[PDB]
C-alpha cells in the first residue's frame, strides 16, 4: 500500500450542499444525451473515452466550451439555470495547464491572489487566515515557504505545483470545484495521495468533479460516484464499488486481474478505421445507453447504488506581484544588462572621437541615427517575448475575473519602467562618452531623455503588437515591418525631401526619425562645429530645422500615446488566447 497519515479536515465549505443537475444535454462539434443530479459531499469522476467530446464536457457544463454550442438540454446549478455569472460565482475551475509566477513562494502566490479574491470587507488577518487554512488543508504546511519555480526548475515538485494550483481556486471557498485531468504527469504515489486530498475536499461539503482518462487500478478504488461513457452517449453512472455488479448483471461482466475502468472503456469503444467497424459499435454505444437510462428511469438522481476589490487595489496588487517576481529573476537581469553594456560599447568604440581624429560630420550623423534605430532590435523581441510568456497566466486571470483590463493595462506598462531605466542608462551613457559628443550636463540629459522616450515609445509599440495579433511569428513580423519602415523613413538611409507622399507621412510618425532629428538638434543646436561653422545652417541643410527640440519630445510622447490607445483597446476586446 501507499501512504497513511493525517486525514483531518482543516478548511471546509461553510454553506449548504449546492446542487448541480443536468437534464438531457446534447452538444456537438460532442455529447448526445445525459441526465444526473449531484450534491456537495460527493466526488464524481468521469472516465469516458479518450478525448471524445468529454475533456470538453467540463467546458460545456460551465458554458465555456468551444467548437460547438449546447444544442438542447438544461443545466442547473443550485437549482438555477446555467449562466456565466453562476459559473463565475459557483464553480472553481482548475485548469490542467496554467502558469504561476516562477519566482514567488507558495504563500506569496496564494496571498497575492487572496488580496484579489476575498471581499474588501476582510481584514488582512482574515485573508491571512484563509491562505493558511488552504495551505494546511492541502498538506502544504510543509514546503509553504519555498519558491514555486517551474523553469526555475529547482523548487517544489509537480504534485506540489498542482496542490498550489488548486489552492488558487480554494482561496475563495468554492462549493463546486471541478478538476480537469488532475493526474496528468503525476507519479503513481503522488496521483494517489492527491486524489485523497480531493476526497477530503469533497468531504468538506464540496461538490468535486473529475474528468480522468485511463485511471490506474488503485485510483479507481478511490472514486465515489463514477460516470462511464463511450463518446457523446453515457453508459453508466453510480457508485464506483458497484460498477462490477451493474455490469456483471447486464451481460458484459468484469474479469479478474483487470482494472474495470480500462476494461470497460475499451468495451464501448467506437473505432474509425473502417466503415463497418464504426458502424457496429456506435450501434453498441447507443444501444447500451438505451438500457441504462431505463434501469434508473424510475429510480431518482439517475444514481445507480459582498463588495469586491476595486480597480485601484488590483493595480496595487498586480504591480506588486509583477515587480516582486521579476526582480528575483537575477539570471535574466544580468543578461539583459550585458546585452545593453557590451552593445553601448560596440557603438561607442566604432565612433570613438577622442584618442585619434575627431568625429567627421556624417560620422556624427550615423552615430545619432544608429543609437535610436538600433534599439528596437533587442527591445522588440523580448517585450513581445515577455507577453507571450504571460498569456497562459493573463487569460485565466482575466476570464475568472479577479481583475479587469483596466488595472493590468496600467500594471503592465509601469512594472517594466524600474527595469527599463537601468537598461537605458547602461545603453545610453557609455555611447555618449566614448564617441566625443557635445560636452555639458544639459546636452547629456536631453540626449538621455529622448532616447528614454523613444525606447519607451517602442516598448508601448511592441507591447501592443503582442496583444493584438494571434501568434508570436505574426506579431514578430508586424513589429519588424514597423521597425523596417520606421528605419527607412527614419531620414538617414533616404532623403526626407525625396519621399513619396506615403513615406513622407510615414516619416512624420516614425519615432526613429524624431530620435534622429532630436539628437541632431541636441548636438548641433547652437555650437559652432570644427572642420568653424555654426550648427544651424548645418541642420537646415538636412531639413532638421523646423519642429524645435521640445516638440520632438511632445511628438514622441504622442506616438507612445497613440500606441497606448491601441494597446488598451487590444486587451479589452481581443481575447488573449495562449499558444
Amino acid at each position: 500500500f501507499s501512504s497513511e497519515s493525517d486525514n483531518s479536515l482543516y478548511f471546509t465549505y461553510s454553506g449548504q450542499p449546492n446542487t448541480l443537475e443536468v437534464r438531457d444535454l446534447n452538444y456537438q462539434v460532442g455529447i448526445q444525451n445525459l441526465s444526473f443530479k449531484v450534491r456537495s459531499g460527493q466526488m464524481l469522476a468521469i472516465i469516458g473515452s479518450s478525448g471524445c467530446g468529454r475533456a470538453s464536457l467540463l467546458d460545456v457544463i460551465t458554458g465555456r466550451g468551444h467548437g460547438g454550442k449546447i444544442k438542447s438540454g438544461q443545466i442547473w446549478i443550485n437549482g438555477q439555470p446555467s449562466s456565466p455569472q453562476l459559473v463565475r460565482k459557483c464553480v472553481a475551475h482548475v485548469r490542467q495547464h496554467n502558469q504561476l509566477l516562477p519566482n514567488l513562494t507558495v504563500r506569496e502566490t496564494l496571498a497575492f491572489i487572496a488580496q484579489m479574491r476575498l471581499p474588501r470587507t476582510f481584514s488582512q488577518a482574515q485573508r491571512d487566515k484563509r491562505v493558511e487554512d488552504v495551505i494546511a488543508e492541502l498538506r502544504l504546511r510543509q514546503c509553504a515557504d519555498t519558491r514555486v519555480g517551474n523553469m526555475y526548475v529547482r523548487g517544489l515538485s509537480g504534485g506540489e505545483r498542482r496542490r498550489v494550483s488548486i489552492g488558487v481556486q480554494l482561496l475563495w471557498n468554492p462549493g463546486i470545484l471541478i478538476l480537469d485531468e488532475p493526474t496528468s504527469g503525476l507519479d503513481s504515489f503522488t496521483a494517489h495521495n492527491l486524489v485523497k486530498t480531493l476526497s477530503r475536499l469533497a468531504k468538506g461539503n464540496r461538490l468535486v468533479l473529475i474528468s480522468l482518462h485511463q485511471p490506474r487500478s488503485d485510483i479507481f478504488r478511490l472514486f465515489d460516484l463514477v460516470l462511464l461513457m463511450t463518446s457523446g452517449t453515457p453508459i453508466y453512472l453510480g457508485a464506483a464499488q458497484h460498477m462490477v455488479q451493474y455490469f456483471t448483471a447486464i451481460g458484459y461482466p468484469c474479469p479478474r486481474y483487470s482494472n474495470p475502468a480500462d476494461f470497460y472503456v475499451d468495451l464501448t469503444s467506437i473505432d474509425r478505421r473502417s466503415r463497418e467497424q464504426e458502424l457496429a459499435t456506435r450501434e453498441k454505444a447507443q444501444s447500451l445507453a438505451a438500457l441504462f437510462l431505463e434501469k434508473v428511469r424510475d429510480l431518482d438522481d439517475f444514481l445507480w447504488k459582498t463588495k469586491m476589490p476595486g480597480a485601484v487595489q488590483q493595480f496595487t496588487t498586480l504591480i506588486r506581484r509583477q515587480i516582486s517576481n521579476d526582480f528575483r529573476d537575477l539570471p535574466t537581469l544580468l543578461i539583459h544588462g550585458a546585452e545593453a553594456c557590451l552593445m553601448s560599447m560596440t557603438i561607442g568604440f566604432l565612433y570613438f572621437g577622442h584618442g585619434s581624429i575627431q568625429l567627421s560630420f556624417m560620422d556624427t550623423a550615423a552615430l545619432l541615427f544608429m543609437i535610436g534605430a538600433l534599439i528596437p532590435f533587442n527591445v522588440i523581441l523580448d517585450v513581445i517575448s515577455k507577453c507571450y510568456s504571460e498569456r497562459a497566466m493573463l487569460y485565466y486571470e482575466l476570464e475568472d475575473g479577479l481583475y479587469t483590463t483596466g488595472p493590468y493595462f496600467f500594471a503592465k506598462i509601469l512594472g517594466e519602467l524600474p527595469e527599463h531605466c537601468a537598461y537605458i542608462i547602461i545603453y545610453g551613457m557609455p555611447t555618449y562618452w566614448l564617441a566625443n559628443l557635445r560636452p555639458g550636463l544639459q546636452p547629456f540629459l536631453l540626449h538621455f531623455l529622448l532616447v528614454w522616450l523613444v525606447v519607451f515609445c517602442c516598448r508601448i509599440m511592441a507591447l501592443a503588437a503582442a496583444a493584438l495579433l494571434p501568434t508570436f511569428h505574426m506579431a514578430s513580423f508586424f513589429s519588424n515591418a514597423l521597425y523596417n519602415s520606421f528605419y527607412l523613413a527614419g531620414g538617414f538611409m533616404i532623403n526626407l525631401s525625396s519621399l513619396w507622399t506615403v513615406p513622407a507621412w510615414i516619416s512624420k510618425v516614425s519615432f526613429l526619425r524624431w530620435c534622429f532629428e532630436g539628437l541632431m538638434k541636441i548636438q548641433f543646436s547652437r555650437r559652432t562645429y570644427k572642420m568653424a561653422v555654426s550648427g544651424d545652417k548645418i541642420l537646415s541643410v538636412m531639413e532638421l530645422d523646423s519642429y524645435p527640440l521640445y516638440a520632438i519630445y511632445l511628438i514622441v510622447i504622442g506616438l507612445s500615446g497613440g500606441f497606448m490607445v491601441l494597446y488598451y483597446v487590444s486587451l479589452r476586446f481581443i481575447k488573449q488566447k495562449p499558444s
Binding site: 486481474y257 544608429m370 513619396w500
Partner: protein, 588 residues
C-alpha cells in the same frame, strides 16, 4: 535455430552516480519481452545499451552475447534495429517514397526493380500497402494517421532485415485502439523468428497475458524477469497477491517502485524493494537465466554472423539519394519554394516602395540614396538567406539524426545534400529580385552593370544561409540562431563596409575585424558598379562618381577582380566548416 540474445552482466555509470546494475537478461527468438519501470529506472538506458548506441560516454563492463558468441562494441549497430518513440518522417514524401529512399540508402547491390519488390514487401506485412503512394502529410484526418506513421517507421527498419528489434515506448502517443494495434503488430513480428524487446509506461490490463517475458528495473537493479505465469507465482510466494480488480501491471509496478514523497517512505519502500529484489536473485527463474546464457556460450550448436549485413554504398552514391530525397521534399512542398524565391523580391519591393528613382542630383539625394540602397542590400541579403535555414532545415535535421544513428548515412552527408539543392533557388531568387527593381530604381542602365550586381548579392544570400547551417549544427534552438545570425549581419555591414564608418579612420580592431567580414568585399564591389560611370548635377562636394569610390574603399577599382574571388570564396569555406561542424555534432 535456437537464435538467442543474452546479457551475461550489465552495468553503466556516468561522471558520478551509476545507472544500471547487474542487468542479466535472456530472450529467445519468437519471444516478445516487455520492460516496465518507473521514472529513472534506466529502462530507456538499457535499450540503448543493447543497440550499442551509447558507445563510450560512460563505462560498460557487461557482456552482450548473440548466438553463443560475444559481440564487440563495434558490432552492436551491426545486428540490432532500434526505433525511437517519436518518429520523424519527411512530410512531403509518400510512404512508397519514404521506404524507397530508405531502401536506397541500405543496400549496395543493384537491380532497382527488385527494390520495388522489397519496398512493396514491407508494406504488405504492416498493412501500409493500402496507403502507399499516398502523401504522409500532417495528422489524422488531414494526412496519415498516428499508427500508420508508427508502421511507416517500422517498415523503414524492416527493409534492413534485422534479427533483433528494440522498441522504445512504441505506445506512448497512441489511442486505446492504435496502441493496442501496435502491440498486436509487435507480437506477430516476434513469433516470426525475430526478437522484439520493448518498454511500456502505462501497460493496460490486456497487455499482460500477451508478453513472453516481463522484467522490472528500479534504479538499474533488475527486480524480476520471467513469464507472466512465473511472475504471478513469484510475488504470491513473496506474499503479495493481485487484488480483485487491480491491473497486475498497475499493482506490481507500485509494489516495486520507490516512493520518495517522504524520508520515511523512501527508506520504507526501499526496504520492501530490497526484499523483493534480493529474493529474486536467489530464485530458480533468476538462475535459470544465468544457466541458460552460458549454456549458449559453450554449446557449439548454432554460431552465426552478425545481421543487417554490412553492405555500404559509397559517399557519392549516398549524397545523390539525399539530394533528390530533399529536393522532392522541397518542390512538392508548395509554400516553401515560393517563399524561398520571393523574399528577396519582397525586400526589394519594400525599398522601391519608399524610394522610387535614384535622382542624379547631388542635393536631392544623388549619393545619400545610393549609399542607402547598397547598405540595405549588403545588410538584408544575408538575413533573408538565413531565414531559409532556420525555417526549413530543423525538420531535415531530426530526420538526419534518427537515420545517422541507424546507419543510413553520416550527419554531414545531410547538409551537403542540403547545401546543393538550395543553389538553384537562391541563384534564381536574386535574379527575380535584381531583374525587377534594379531597372526600376534606375541605378545605372548598362547591361554589364546589372550582370555584376546580380552575382555580387548572390554570395551574401548564400553566405547567410550556409552560416546558419554550421550554427544549427551545434546550436539546437533555431529561434536563437535566428537571433544570432541577424546580430552578425547587422554587425557585419556596420563594420565591414565603409558606408557608416569610413574604413580608414576607425580604430584598429574595427579595421582588423573588417578584413574578415564578407560584407567588406561585397560593398567594395557594389560601390564600384554604380559610382564608376556617373556624373552629377547641382554642400555639393562630389561631382563625378570616381570621387566617392575614392573617399571610401580607396583603390577598390583596382581590386575588383580580387574582391569577387574573395567574396565568393566564403561559400566553399562554410560548406567545409559545416562538414567538420557536423562530425562534432556526431558526438553530442
Amino acid at each position: 535455430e535456437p537464435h538467442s540474445l543474452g546479457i551475461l552482466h550489465a552495468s553503466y555509470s556516468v561522471s558520478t552516480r551509476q545507472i544500471l546494475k547487474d542487468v542479466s537478461l535472456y530472450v529467445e527468438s519468437g519471444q516478445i519481452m516487455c520492460i516496465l519501470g518507473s521514472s529513472g529506472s534506466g529502462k530507456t538506458t538499457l535499450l540503448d545499451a543493447m543497440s550499442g548506441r551509447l558507445g563510450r560516454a560512460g563505462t560498460f563492463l557487461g557482456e552482450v552475447y548473440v548466438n553463443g558468441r560475444a559481440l564487440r562494441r563495434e558490432q552492436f549497430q551491426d545486428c540490432f534495429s532500434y526505433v525511437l518513440q517519436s518518429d520523424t518522417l519527411l512530410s512531403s514524401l509518400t510512404v512508397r517514397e519514404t521506404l524507397h529512399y530508405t531502401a536506397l540508402l541500405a543496400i549496395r547491390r543493384g537491380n532497382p526493380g527488385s527494390f520495388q519488390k522489397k519496398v512493396e514487401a514491407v508494406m504488405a506485412e504492416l498493412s501500409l500497402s493500402h496507403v502507399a503512394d499516398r502523401l504522409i502529410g500532417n495528422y489524422s484526418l488531414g494526412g496519415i494517421s498516428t499508427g500508420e506513421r508508427r508502421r511507416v517507421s517500422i517498415a523503414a527498419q524492416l527493409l534492413q532485415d534485422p534479427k533483433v528489434m528494440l522498441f522504445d515506448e512504441p505506445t506512448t502517443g497512441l489511442d486505446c485502439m492504435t496502441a493496442n494495434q501496435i502491440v498486436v503488430l509487435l507480437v506477430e513480428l516476434a513469433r516470426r523468428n525475430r526478437i522484439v524487446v520493448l518498454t511500456i509506461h502505462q501497460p493496460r490490463s490486456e497487455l499482460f497475458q500477451l508478453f513472453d517475458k516481463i522484467a522490472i528495473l528500479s534504479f538499474g537493479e533488475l527486480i524480476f524477469c520471467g513469464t507472466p505465469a512465473e511472475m504471478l507465482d513469484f510475488f504470491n510466494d513473496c506474499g503479495y497477491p493481485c487484488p480483485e480488480h487491480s491491473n497486475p501491471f498497475d499493482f506490481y509496478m507500485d509494489l516495486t517502485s520507490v516512493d520518495t514523497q517522504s524520508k520515511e517512505r523512501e527508506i520504507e519502500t526501499s526496504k520492501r524493494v530490497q526484499m523483493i529484489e534480493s529474493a529474486y536473485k536467489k530464485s530458480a527463474i533468476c538462475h535459470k537465466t544465468l544457466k541458460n546464457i552460458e549454456r549458449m556460450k559453450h554449446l557449439k550448436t548454432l554460431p552465426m554472423v552478425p545481421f543487417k549485413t554490412k553492405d555500404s554504398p559509397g559517399v557519392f552514391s549516398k549524397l545523390g539519394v539525399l539530394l533528390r530525397r530533399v529536393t522532392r521534399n522541397l518542390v512538392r512542398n508548395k509554400l516553401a519554394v515560393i517563399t524561398r524565391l520571393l523574399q528577396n523580391l519582397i525586400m526589394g519591393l519594400f525599398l522601391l516602395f519608399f524610394v522610387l528613382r535614384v535622382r542624379s542630383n547631388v542635393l536631392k539625394g544623388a549619393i545619400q540614396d545610393r549609399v542607402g540602397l547598397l547598405y540595405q542590400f549588403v545588410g538584408a541579403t544575408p538575413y533573408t538567406g538565413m531565414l531559409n535555414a532556420v525555417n526549413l532545415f530543423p525538420v531535415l535535421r531530426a530526420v538526419s539524426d534518427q537515420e545517422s544513428q541507424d546507419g543510413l548515412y553520416q550527419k554531414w552527408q545531410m547538409m551537403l545534400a542540403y547545401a546543393l539543392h538550395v543553389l538553384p533557388f537562391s541563384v534564381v531568387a536574386t535574379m527575380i529580385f535584381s531583374s525587377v527593381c534594379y531597372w526600376t530604381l534606375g541605378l545605372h542602365p548598362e547591361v554589364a552593370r546589372f550582370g555584376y550586381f546580380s552575382a555580387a548579392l548572390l554570395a551574401p544570400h548564400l553566405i547567410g544561409e550556409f552560416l546558419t547551417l554550421v550554427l544549427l549544427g551545434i546550436v539546437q534552438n533555431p529561434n536563437i540562431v535566428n537571433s544570432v545570425v541577424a546580430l552578425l549581419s547587422i554587425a557585419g555591414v556596420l563594420v565591414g563596409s565603409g558606408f557608416l564608418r569610413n574604413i580608414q579612420e576607425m580604430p584598429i580592431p574595427f579595421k582588423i575585424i573588417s578584413y574578415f567580414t564578407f560584407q567588406k568585399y561585397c560593398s567594395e564591389i557594389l560601390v564600384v558598379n554604380e559610382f564608376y560611370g556617373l556624373n552629377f548635377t547641382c554642400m555639393c562636394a562630389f561631382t563625378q562618381g570616381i570621387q566617392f569610390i575614392e573617399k571610401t574603399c580607396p583603390g577598390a577599382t583596382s581590386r575588383f577582380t580580387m574582391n569577387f574571388l574573395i567574396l565568393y570564396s566564403f561559400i566553399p569555406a562554410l560548406v567545409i566548416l559545416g562538414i567538420v561542424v557536423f562530425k562534432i555534432r556526431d558526438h553530442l
